[PDB]
């Protein structure tokens, strides 16, 4: 629906995002569009510091506002991390922080790049008459020449969109349970499983478009945040807007609404327990667009799909429920392999692994089998 801002084609992603801002913001667009060149040449922080505080009043519709969040969030990452070898900035100039925070509070997101910026809104179709394929798609922004940002962000999105195809089946699952349509429920659960099975196959493209050295040594620097970060132990002064510095976490697929919503749908209690894994995924919901955050708590309001299947003594239903759980297990298992190639191996030339393995365990132990 439109009350939750879920598109029938791309789900939680922003459909056909805006590429251009009103000419009044050209001084933003130029820095954002040339971050690689400007960083390399020691001129990024300069060009930022020479900016005039612009007003967000000319950002009239949602898409224009989302684009500027992406522009300003990428500038902020560039400004704070600089060249990504340690010369850090801990105060962000008012000429940029003030419009950023005002545009942020209006869209109900923290003033920091989030998944919904750099994946869900950081894309375009090359030719609009051709479909959503990697070859028909590009990102809007990058940080460095060679950072594989187009590969990482686009493959992330294409997996999102693949998994997104199961979202339209959630209403039928809940109506089938309510009106006791056993065979309809079963068909719906297998269609959802089928969708999470394609999402895995899409994920395979990551290897052609991302390389480990670039992800580990470049891209991950610019996706990092300032929450529990020793390089900014107290957070980031948003000059002109907040007195004391604030801590906000970096971009994460933990901020994706598709995967969190299938854990909810299936009663995989990712956000229960009180433990570190659950608390993290709960926190990451505040880094989501408000309608998407609301979608998820609305799913939790609904009768448990798991408890209904469990109580029914129906092997066919249980195999279908498990076909969905299994697909998440498979997805998460593949992801652990990818995390070995792109983080763990390069780093030899963690709390990460324990977090992912706890989420994957909770998923596997949800199987009925
Ligand atoms: C080079 C590729 C990738 C790397 C190195 C990577 C790495 C990581 C790491 C280290 C985490 C845990 C830390 C954190 O949350 O910040 C994580 C979480 C997560 N990643 Fe990735 N990721 C990659 C691509 C993807 C893709 C393509 C997807 C999904 C389509 C994905 C889905 C997730 C999800 C859903 C989580 C949250 C926990 C979970 O639900 O299992 N990642 N990723
Ligand atoms: O683990 C973190 C280490 C440093 C900060 C960024 C790294 C993970 N962030 C991600 C961002 C986006 Br966008 C998408 C993602 N999918 N999976 C992980 C991830």
From Swiss-Prot:
Query: Which residue ranges run through the membrane?
Result: none
Keyword entries, A-Z:
Cytoplasm, Dioxygenase, Heme, Immunity, Iron, Metal-binding, Oxidoreductase, Tryptophan catabolism
The induction text for this entry reads: By IFNG/IFN-gamma in most cells. Exogenous inflammatory stimuli induce the expression of IDO1 in antigen-presenting cells such as dendritic cells, macrophages and B-cells.
Stated EC number for the protein is 1.13.11.52
Instruction: Name its GO BP terms in alphabetical order.
Output: 'de novo' NAD biosynthetic process from L-tryptophan; female pregnancy; inflammatory response; kynurenic acid biosynthetic process; L-tryptophan catabolic process; L-tryptophan catabolic process to kynurenine; multicellular organismal response to stress; negative regulation of interleukin-10 production
Broad class of where this protein is predominantly found: cytoplasm
Catalysed reaction equations from the record: D-tryptophan + O2 = N-formyl-D-kynurenine; L-tryptophan + O2 = N-formyl-L-kynurenine
Pfam (any one) = IDO
Q: What is this protein called?
A: Indoleamine 2,3-dioxygenase 1
